[PDB]
Design a protein around this ligand. Sequence first.
Ligand code: CLA
Ligand code: CLA
Ligand code: CLA
Ligand SMILES: CC1=C(/C=C/C(C)=C/C=C/C(C)=C/C=C/C=C(C)/C=C/C=C(C)/C=C/C2=C(C)CCCC2(C)C)C(C)(C)CCC1
Ligand SMILES: CC1=C(/C=C/C(C)=C/C=C/C(C)=C/C=C/C=C(C)/C=C/C=C(C)/C=C/C2=C(C)CCCC2(C)C)C(C)(C)CCC1
Ligand SMILES: CC1=C(C/C=C(\C)CCC[C@H](C)CCC[C@H](C)CCCC(C)C)C(=O)c2ccccc2C1=O
Ligand code: SF4
Ligand code: SF4
Lengths: 193, 80, 91, 31, 732, 64, 152
Amino acid sequence: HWMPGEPRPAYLDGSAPGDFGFDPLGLGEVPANLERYKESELIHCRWAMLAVPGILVPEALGYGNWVKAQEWAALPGGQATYLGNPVPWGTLPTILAIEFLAIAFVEHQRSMEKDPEKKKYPGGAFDPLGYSKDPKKLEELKVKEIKNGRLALLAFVGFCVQQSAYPGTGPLENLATHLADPWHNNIGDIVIP
Amino acid sequence: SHSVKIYDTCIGCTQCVRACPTDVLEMIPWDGCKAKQIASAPRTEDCVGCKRCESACPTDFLSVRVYLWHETTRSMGLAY
Amino acid sequence: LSPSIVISLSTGLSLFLGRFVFFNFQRENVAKQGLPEQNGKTHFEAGDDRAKEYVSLLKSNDPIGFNIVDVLAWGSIGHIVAYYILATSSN
Amino acid sequence: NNLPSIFVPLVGLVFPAIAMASLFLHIQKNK
Amino acid sequence: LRFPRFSQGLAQDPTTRRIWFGIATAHDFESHDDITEERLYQNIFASHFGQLAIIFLWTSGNLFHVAWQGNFETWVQDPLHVRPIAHAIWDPHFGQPAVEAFTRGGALGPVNIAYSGVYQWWYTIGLRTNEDLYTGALFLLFLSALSLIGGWLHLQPKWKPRVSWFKNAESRLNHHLSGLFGVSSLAWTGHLVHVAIPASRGEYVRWNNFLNVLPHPQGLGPLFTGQWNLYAQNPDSSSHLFGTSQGSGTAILTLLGGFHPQTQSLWLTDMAHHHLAIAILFLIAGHMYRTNFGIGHSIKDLLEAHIPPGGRLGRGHKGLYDTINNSIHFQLGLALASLGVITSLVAQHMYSLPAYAFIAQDFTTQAALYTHHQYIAGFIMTGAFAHGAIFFIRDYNPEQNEDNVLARMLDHKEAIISHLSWASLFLGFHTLGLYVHNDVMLAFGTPEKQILIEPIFAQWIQSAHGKTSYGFDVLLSSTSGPAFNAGRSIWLPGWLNAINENSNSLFLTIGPGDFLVHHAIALGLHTTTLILVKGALDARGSKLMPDKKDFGYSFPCDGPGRGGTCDISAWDAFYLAVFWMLNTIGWVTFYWHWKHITLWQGNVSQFNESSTYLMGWLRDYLWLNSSQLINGYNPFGMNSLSVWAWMFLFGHLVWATGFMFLISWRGYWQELIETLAWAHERTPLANLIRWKDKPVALSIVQARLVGLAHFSVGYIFTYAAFLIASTSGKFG
Amino acid sequence: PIGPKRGSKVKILRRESYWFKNVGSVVAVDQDPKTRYPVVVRFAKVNYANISTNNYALDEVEEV
Amino acid sequence: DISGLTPCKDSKQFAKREKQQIKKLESSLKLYAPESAPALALNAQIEKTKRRFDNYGKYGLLCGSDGLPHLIVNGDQRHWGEFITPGILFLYIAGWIGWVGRSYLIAISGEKKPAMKEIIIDVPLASRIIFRGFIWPVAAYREFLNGDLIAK
Ligand code: CLA
Ligand code: CLA
Ligand code: CLA
Ligand SMILES: CC1=C(/C=C/C(C)=C/C=C/C(C)=C/C=C/C=C(C)/C=C/C=C(C)/C=C/C2=C(C)CCCC2(C)C)C(C)(C)CCC1
Ligand SMILES: CC1=C(/C=C/C(C)=C/C=C/C(C)=C/C=C/C=C(C)/C=C/C=C(C)/C=C/C2=C(C)CCCC2(C)C)C(C)(C)CCC1
Ligand SMILES: CC1=C(C/C=C(\C)CCC[C@H](C)CCC[C@H](C)CCCC(C)C)C(=O)c2ccccc2C1=O
Ligand code: SF4
Ligand code: SF4
């Protein structure tokens, strides 16, 4: 339970993976709306669980934080770089053309599926290593996946919020700053001036 | 001539026919109420439209209704 | 300085996208949203003689039923995109 | 010019009289 | 049968009521004998054709009179020192001093000075000689004749449209959006580029040579190659003189922003770009709905699928397509609401961003245009609610509209009415209290005790647009913000130059008086909306008259029973709302006129100090500015302002006359009339003449309409005379 | 016996009534099968005609 | 300096207004003997005017170009005394009055002829009810929470 001593909603029986009876606003009363929300939550968790490795590793190697990598496109004629090496196809109009075309096909392909179970865990060709053979392990795996995704979403929220308070600073820079003098570099001096 | 209608919520207390300034309304026998009476409007061509009948109806909403309609020399009260 | 004739290749890309990717979505949306109707009857069958659908134009020998109206619409989208790209540059 | 000396009385005195006479005859008609 | 031909019941009336009611129900095609839907639609179509013909004839007459009796050619050379002439005067009743006084301008006789702004409008669009106006008048006469012929043709059995044609909403929407708005705006840009822009640069382009002059030196080559930036090069210099080639450029589409330095109006190359962009936008949007080509949207399916899954809106928009399509009062109300909003926007925008050359320096024209458009917008806004109530009475079907958005508003009408009443009462109470407190403070000689409140939010909004007169330094007023940096190289320089110059009407400075008058305007709007909404929602019945829908839209009463039912119909609800609309528009126009008069005289401090109390208004606006009006004619002579004083007194007379019909009621007058018939019948040499229709007093509903008409006519004429005379006596 | 008993409280379901969705007390019920509106209800508040009594049918009153 | 305003104590027009009012008051004083009562009244009026102007100067108000104080109601802490605190006081008093009226109306609703207790007030019951409105916010909040506030 998300809070002991609180009654659970009737539609949250606790049988779904990663279900802890959390719905204070009652946004999932409609059976059709609840089924869609699980797919959206899984998509968000999967997308955010890939950004975290890509937001710290480039910074930890001294290539700059995650917001400096987008400044070149505002400049006229700016060219992209990777591992310190400029890419020949790093022009702005070329970058958008491949990005839109490549993902407009996969997302539309995902939309066309009609079986609700496959919209979340399609199986088949996306599971080459055969981790879905055991139904007993599958439930604990789904619980592990759901539990980590919300943590990654919270981590991304922290990443985004810390940037607003300290412009031009990276999350690892934030950790280093806090580690030096913990009792004066923290949330307190921001909440009250 | 104006239109006068009677509805079956009548209780037959004869209050409308007594307040008529002309001879328009009258009472006929009926079954459906304790008084065993109901009003009638056989002479609507003499109606002037002062709506005194509706001022005397005791029923919550009126069991007698007057709808103003095409005007004649009788319904305008002219004695030229 | 980009050439105008080469930039108009966006028409081919838009036609390819319409014919090979978004065909089924558009067809099923059109099937779901039927013909406009008044009082439960379509415009033609209610009495309007000028509201008859043009069957002859709809018949095409394309294997998947690609029409000429679809060609016109996707080509218009491609031309709009190409001219937006051309106009935005050289500023 | 001399046109206003004609059109002004023609519009203000003659046409209103003609229109009023015709309209009175039309609204007073019966069959 | 006799007049009226369309009403059997009225034609048998033996009294004079037959004529009065015969005139007043001619255009209500729904209540005529033996009427069908098809005949109704055909009659509406013919009436629309006739209205178009009348409009074309009116415009043609205006042009012909300006050409024949005006001074357009000499006004062009010196726009700022010539008074435009509307038409000539031929009144046999005039005396010699009247002939001398009204002979103004370069005329050879009495004339009228035009205040409609037609001269500046025609001069801006490229008309330069009297020969152009004659051609325009001839073309408009031809257009009116064509409209009449087209109107007559469609009433014949061969060319009669059917009801199914009138109910094809998708095709009509597509065609209107694509052509009537997009192609129409595309042609205006062509006219501007080909004629009007060359005209302002000293080039003469007409029909006989427009096929040999290139609007741009490079032709259409840049357009097809995508090199659209070549059309914006070399714009007009800041030293440009309008109508001449000194300091002119060659561009045709620009984004300069601001005002022309000499004419104090918008650049001619900005309007062409604006019309081109809006034409493209309208042309694209006209391809949305489904027609017989197999693609598009269905409006019925669009409405039926927009229902929230939570059920908080009931069934949503289901069945609304047939409700709107089968009802014409619904469509008329929607159109009237949109038209009123658009007219108000036009009135608000034309005074602060002038588009015609030398119209900002003509002070008498601006106020007249503003007042005219605002009053028209108010009337249209009243009509929208009136026709909404008519729709609710006549065309609403409860069964087909079960539990949708339309039906759920009749469920909780009490809450809406009560909340509107609360808002109105709150606003009125506090505004009147503050005004009376300020007046009492000024009466006792202690002006420092006033409650003066700065309009902080409006000043913040003004600072957000780049105004630096308050020191807020936000957004466009901050030079380091992203918003300022984004547009600093396109339009920000001109806009900032125009907004920070304190002689024009672009974002005038505001104070506590603006706060008070704005809240008074809000109170008026809320009260008028309350009256109209209460009238519309209670149209089908209430607790006092549950069966109101069986008695129609307009009826006098329900008798003196149940306490009395005076003014119980929705028509009386509309009738009570005209007074409030007039009051609100009067307040708005008073505020505008006083503020602009104080601005033009160069004594803005007077308005700032004297507008916080009502005695200040009464003394420094009405009493002070009416001196030249009431001196039009005196025991010593007369001048050119005599007609405005005469109209002032005439409007006072009509406004006072309306009170007789508004206050006294019918029963007093029938008894008085009954004696005059006896007097006529008993008089010798006069009883030889007898009437054909028995005289009677005016009906209950008729007298209300007559009184309202007198009231409105007096209001309009009196204010128009005062405004026009007071502006023209001072600023010409 | 026909309809509600005397002294019981009923609410009105007649839309054109002054006391619509209001509670009243039953005074008497006429047992004649030919009577159309036999239930007599008395209310605490008066209507616009200063009347506090009415007759209702069996289908326009419900027990509360 | 919000919206280009200036403090009262730094405004010259404020002092000019004070001087003009004082000079106007002193002109009528020359018509009366110093010991006469109207002279005392005029002296008191002059002293009151001076005290009022000094008090306005002390409270940190803002003056416009005309030398008149202006009120800021946007919520700045520097001007919370012009609008915020009197507003809260008014809200408290109005809630007290409304709660007392509602309680009195509810109390007499169960009587045989409640309309008779509205034109002839039951003074002891009202007096016992009057003191209860001093804690109206708590009672109103708890009544809202229990669902008693709104009629069913
Ligand atoms: C100058 C004339 C005048 C004034 C002051 C009002 C004022 C008002 N009208 Mg109104 N009205 C007028 C003319 C006027 N009308 C005309 C000519 C018409 C056309 C017939 C209408 C039609 C009309 C309609 C249709 C409606 C109103 C409504 C209202 C009220 C809502 C506005 C508000 O906020 O209340 C502000 C409150 C006040 C201005 C009242 C001031 C209270 C003071 C303090 C009274 C003091 C009493 C005394 C000093 C103490 C005792 C002393 C002893 C000698 C008596 C308001 C009281 C609406 C309404 O009543 O519902 C909300 C409404 O629906 N009016
Ligand atoms: C229902 C009442 C009402 C209405 C219709 C308006 C309408 C308007 N106000 Mg306004 N105003 C109101 C109440 C109202 N006001 C009150 C109570 C205050 C004092 C706080 C103000 C202070 C104010 C300023 C300072 C300005 C306006 C302005 C304006 C105009 C522009 C729109 C705007 O800024 O909205 C403003 C809308 C609001 C402030 C919302 C108020 C509505 C709530 C529900 C009132 C509740 C009062 C609340 C209980 C007070 C609690 C305070 C307490 C903690 C001490 C517009 C005509 C501007 C303008 O153009 O002036 C020329 C402007 O500069 N208003
Ligand atoms: C300013 C408004 C006004 C005006 C002009 C009038 C005028 C009149 N009222 Mg009156 N009245 C008013 C407001 C007004 N009232 C108000 C507010 C009330 C309170 C409800 C009353 C209550 C009232 C009562 C109770 C009675 C009158 C009566 C009369 C008439 C007196 C006899 C007569 O013929 O006088 C002479 C007429 C005039 C002076 C008006 C004409 C003005 C000049 C001469 C214009 C002439 C133009 C000329 C004919 C050419 C026109 C042609 C055209 C093409 C232009 C007179 C018409 C009495 C009546 O019916 O007659 C005995 C009567 O009993 N009134
Ligand atoms: C036969 C065939 C084929 C081929 C085909 C093709 C190749 C086709 C094409 C087609 C096309 C190729 C089409 C097109 C179209 C186009 C369009 C439809 C256009 C439009 C346009 C527009 C709409 C425009 C607009 C505009 C704007 C917006 C602005 C500026 C101006 C302009 C005017 C430009 C194949 C072998 C494969 C197979 C077998 C069969
Ligand atoms: C009764 C009735 C009716 C009628 C009604 C009416 C008449 C109404 C009206 C209404 C109205 C009359 C409304 C209005 C509205 C408005 C609005 C809604 C507005 C909005 C605005 C906005 C949205 C804005 C925006 C913006 C932007 C975008 C930018 C800048 C800033 C701003 C903010 C300005 C009908 C027939 C239907 C039906 C039956 C019944
Ligand atoms: C004065 C008055 C009369 C008497 C006035 C009458 C009968 C006037 C009748 C018309 C006369 C003959 C003057 C007509 C003036 C017009 C300008 C002429 C016709 C114009 C056409 C366009 C119609 C009433 O009948 C009445 C009825 C109900 C409430 C109030 C009153 C009321 O106040
Ligand atoms: S309206 Fe008058 S005349 Fe007609 S029936 Fe009733 S009381 Fe008699
Ligand atoms: S005064 Fe006239 S309108 Fe009013 S209730 Fe009596 S008869 Fe009807």
